[PDB]
Amino acid sequence: EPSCRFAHQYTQEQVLQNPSKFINDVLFWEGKFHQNNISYNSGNGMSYDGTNIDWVTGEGTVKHPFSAASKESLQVMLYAHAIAGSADAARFLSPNNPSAAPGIAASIMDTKLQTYLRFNETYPGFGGFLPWFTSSSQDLTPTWDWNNRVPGLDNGELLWAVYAFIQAAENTSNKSFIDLAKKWQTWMDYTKTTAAHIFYQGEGKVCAVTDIKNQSLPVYHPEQTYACEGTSYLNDPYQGELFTWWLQFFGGLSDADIEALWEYKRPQLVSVDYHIGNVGPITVQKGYWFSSHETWKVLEMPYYDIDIIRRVFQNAERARTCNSVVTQVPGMFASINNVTDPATGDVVGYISNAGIPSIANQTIQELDVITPYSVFPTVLFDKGVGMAWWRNMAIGKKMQNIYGSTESTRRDGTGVSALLTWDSKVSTVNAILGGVSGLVSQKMKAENIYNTFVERIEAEYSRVFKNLKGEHVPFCLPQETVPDTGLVDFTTCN
Ligand SMILES: OC[C@H]1O[C@@H](O[C@H]2[C@H](O[C@H]3[C@H](O[C@H]4[C@H](O[C@@H]5[C@@H](O)[C@H](O)[C@@H](CO)O[C@H]5O)O[C@H](CO)[C@@H](O)[C@@H]4O)O[C@H](CO)[C@@H](O)[C@@H]3O)O[C@H](CO)[C@@H](O)[C@@H]2O)[C@H](O)[C@@H](O)[C@@H]1O
Ligand SMILES: *[C@@H]1O[C@H](CO)[C@@H](O)[C@H](O)[C@H]1NC(C)=O
Ligand SMILES: *[C@@H]1O[C@H](CO)[C@@H](O)[C@H](O)[C@H]1NC(C)=O
Ligand SMILES: *[C@@H]1O[C@H](CO)[C@@H](O)[C@H](O)[C@H]1NC(C)=O
Ligand SMILES: *[C@@H]1O[C@H](CO)[C@@H](O)[C@H](O)[C@H]1NC(C)=O
């Protein structure tokens, strides 16, 4: 039903008055991303990072033929809600026939597993984990750059997504869904046996990227070896923490090794106060850039069952929203693709360092480009405010298309990234669906690791975050619009 360019059909106040109505429109158009050659390969069930869309028409042109476990996690989390019978997930997957959404999820996940298993057989050295891969042909291959290299962070995201999906499928009592779930359990369970050998260097050090001697050799072939790539470790409270939990619960580590994990992580868990102009102080968890994407972990595990954690991450959104008002930005910041060069149709590069410098480890930041997916952590606390910010950015010229929101816009409105990715679009969708932490905590309780999670994570957070400031500071609403400098809406969405 809804117009492609629905964002400017609403006033901001109307989004706050009925978030659900607005969100219903959002999910419909975001769902159009879910098509073969746009977001995934229906032949092998594998995600693509995304695709370029034409500068003028806003139609799909040239896909990214590569992806990673990180995008798999976003896709799998969506399918977990879909197979559970979420009406919102059905709006995305199968709006014209919602009852079909579960079977669609089941079918793709079945095809997907087969591909995962063919990859494992051909490249047993990965030990059941996924590198960055090319998904444009029936069988997966590592991208050239990622031969014999595997990232802990992206896989940590995928593993808890699959964990959630298994639970959702089993919750249906549908026999074929349970059969599918058990095949995924087998895949997931295999990673438990290889995880420490591949990623755990010892003394609490976990490889960000593991270098594999030869990906064609089995994990325990006498010649196979695994070493951390340089000196980069998963030792911080961002997305990589999902993998820490994988090692702790399933890796076969000693109690001394588990204690070492948290000990080695502890110096990167830091309290700082955001305070600029009349906003703050607001006590937050110090970010890497304070890019929104750094908060990904709360989508996958029940961090917000712990009140101190819930309060610290609520403060994050006080700072995030109000930072953009006080610095007069018509959006918020996260790691994102840069603008398209209209002359070439190519994205000029990737902007990693986009966040909030004053509350960030990495203070040298590029803040000329804003993205709708920056709202995903806000959405978790307040759908209305989240969607108000989403709308403010989506109103920008070319910031909607026939596949939903566009990747990013310059905050001065002189350029746009004419691109679609899971990262910039379905991160928000998953936040709207409430993450998969519910499903995960169910299965964690059933497997009796829930209490350990709460105890450990409440201990670590309660130990550094005392005497929080700024908990009375309300979330801020957008006060500036994206300038119209002459860019013209896509001709298929205006
Ligand atoms: O899909 C979007 C876009 O991705 C482009 O790749 C980027 C990459 O983005 C990915 C990133 O995760 C990567 C990880 O970076 C770490 C940060 O996420 C983390 O917050 C930080 C602090 O702990 O530490 C960083 O090292 O590093 C790994 C490589 O060693 C990657 O395997 C991993 O994907 O964020 C998301 C994870 O939640 C990913 O979904 C996202 O793709 O970030 C790199 C560092 O900023 C950057 O150099 C790279 O260009 C990709 O090039 C582009 O084609 C895609 O459209
Ligand atoms: C992956 O391959 C290994 C070694 O070839 C095998 O033992 C393992 O069971 C496979 N993993 C899965 C989930 O099938
Ligand atoms: C990796 O192992 C495969 C499988 O035996 C072999 O064919 C290939 O030559 C090896 N590559 C290197 C660089 O040793
Ligand atoms: C993004 O593009 C702008 C030009 O629009 C350029 O000045 C900036 O350095 C670019 N940044 C990256 C990381 O590509
Ligand atoms: C960033 O984090 C590292 C690792 O904990 C720390 O040693 C360094 O001092 C931090 N730098 C800043 C500017 O926060």
Give phi and psi for 312, each to the nearest 5. -65, -40
Residues after which the chain has a gap (C–N > 2.5 Å): none
Q: How far apart are CA 349 and CA 22, in angstroms?
A: 32
Count other C-beta atoms under 10 Å from residue 172's C-beta: 16
**Which amino acid type is present at position 315?**
N
User: What are the contacts of 257-260 at 24+ separation with CB within 8 A?
Assistant: 257/200, 257/202, 257/204, 260/202, 260/203, 260/204
**Is the distance from the beta carbon of residue 452 to the nearest atom of ligand 5 less than 6 Å?**
no
255: Cβ contacts below 8 Å, ≥ 6 apart: none
Q: Are the C-beta atoms of 214 and 125 separated by less than 8 Å? A: yes
**Which amino acid type is present at position 296?**
W
Count other C-beta atoms under 10 Å from residue 17's C-beta: 12
* First-to-final CA distance of the chain: 15
Point out the ligand 4 atom lying closest to the alpha carbon of residue 415: 5
* Domain boundaries of the chain, sorted by first residue: 1-494
Residue appearing with tokens 């209209």: 342
Q: Are the C-beta atoms of 299 and 430 separated by less than 8 Å? A: yes
Q: How far apart are CA 377 and CA 419, in angstroms?
A: 22
Q: CA dihedral in degrees (163, 168, 171, 173; nearest 10)?
A: -110
Q: Which two tokens stand for residue 478?
A: 């957008």
CA proximity to 420, closest of 97, 106, 37: 37
CA proximity to 367, closest of 435, 311, 425, 290: 290
Q: Are the C-beta atoms of 367 and 356 separated by less than 8 Å? A: no
Q: Are the C-beta atoms of 236 and 288 separated by less than 8 Å? A: yes
**Is the distance from the beta carbon of residue 219 to the nearest atom of ligand 2 less than 6 Å?**
no
- DSSP category for residue 351: E
For 134-143, give one letter per residue: b (16+ CB within 10 A) or e. Answer: bbbeeebbbb
Residue appearing with tokens 């028409």: 57
**Is the distance from the beta carbon of residue 361 to the nearest atom of ligand 5 less than 6 Å?**
yes
Identify the helix (H) or strand (E) that includes residue 62: strand 60-64
Q: How far apart are CA 301 and CA 14, in angstroms?
A: 32
Q: How far apart are CA 54 and CA 24, in angstroms?
A: 26
Best probe residue, ligand 5, of 269, 288, 361 (max atoms within 8 Å of C-beta): 361
Give phi and psi for 255, each to the nearest 5. -65, -35
Point out the ligand 1 atom lying closest to the alpha carbon of residue 73: 40
Nearest-5° Cα angle at 464, 460 to 467: 130
Q: How was this structure determined?
A: X-ray
Point out the ligand 3 atom lying closest to the alpha carbon of residue 214: 1
CA of residue 215 to ligand 3 center, whole Å: 8
For 173-185, give one letter per residue: b (16+ CB within 10 A) or e. Answer: ebeebeebbebbe
211, β-bridge pairs = 149, 227
Residue nearest to atom 5 of ligand 5 (CA): 268
**Is the distance from the beta carbon of residue 486 to the nearest atom of ligand 5 less than 6 Å?**
no
Q: How far apart are CA 442 and CA 353, in angstroms?
A: 36
Residue nearest to atom 8 of ligand 2 (CA): 190
Q: How far apart are CA 356 and CA 223, in angstroms?
A: 46
Alpha carbon separation from 293 to 159, 338, 475 (Å, rounded): 18, 16, 19
Alpha carbon separation from 237 to 197, 201, 240, 369 (Å, rounded): 23, 19, 7, 25
Q: How far apart are CA 407 and CA 417, in angstroms?
A: 6
DSSP string covering 306-331: SHHHHHHHHHHHHHHHHHHHHTT-SS
Write the Ramachandran bin of 442: left for phi over 0, alpha for psi from -120 to 50, otherwise beta.
alpha
Q: CA dihedral in degrees (337, 338, 339, 345; nearest 10)?
A: -60
DSSP string covering 426-443: HHHHHHHTT-SHHHHHHH
Q: How far apart are CA 27 and CA 6, in angstroms?
A: 12
Burial (CB count <10 Å: 0-12, 13-18, 19+), residue 309: buried
Point out the ligand 5 atom lying closest to the alpha carbon of residue 286: 14
Q: How far apart are CA 211 and CA 230, in angstroms?
A: 9
CA 148, 149, 152, 158 torsion-angle sign = negative
Q: How far apart are CA 411 and CA 378, in angstroms?
A: 19
CA 244, 248, 254, 256 torsion-angle sign = positive
Give phi and psi for 151, each to the nearest 5. -95, 130
Answer whether the bond into residue 19 is a cis peptide, omega within 30°: no
Task: Note the helical H segments in 172-301.
Answer: 175-199, 241-250, 255-265
**Which amino acid type is present at position 404?**
G
Residue nearest to atom 14 of ligand 4 (CA): 349
Residue nearest to atom 3 of ligand 2 (CA): 124
Burial (CB count <10 Å: 0-12, 13-18, 19+), residue 400: buried
421, β-bridge pairs = 50
424: Cβ contacts below 8 Å, ≥ 6 apart: 50, 336, 337, 371, 372, 373, 405, 407, 408
For 74-86, give one letter per residue: b (16+ CB within 10 A) or e. Answer: bbbbbbbbbbbbb
Q: Kindly give the pairing relationship between strand 271-276 and strand 279-285.
A: antiparallel
Burial (CB count <10 Å: 0-12, 13-18, 19+), residue 273: middle
Three-class DSSP category at 444: helix
Count other C-beta atoms under 10 Å from residue 349's C-beta: 10
Q: How far apart are CA 393 and CA 351, in angstroms?
A: 17
**Is the distance from the beta carbon of residue 352 to the nearest atom of ligand 1 less than 6 Å?**
yes
CA of residue 208 to ligand 3 center, whole Å: 24
Q: Which listed ligand is nearest to 162 at the C-alpha?
A: 2
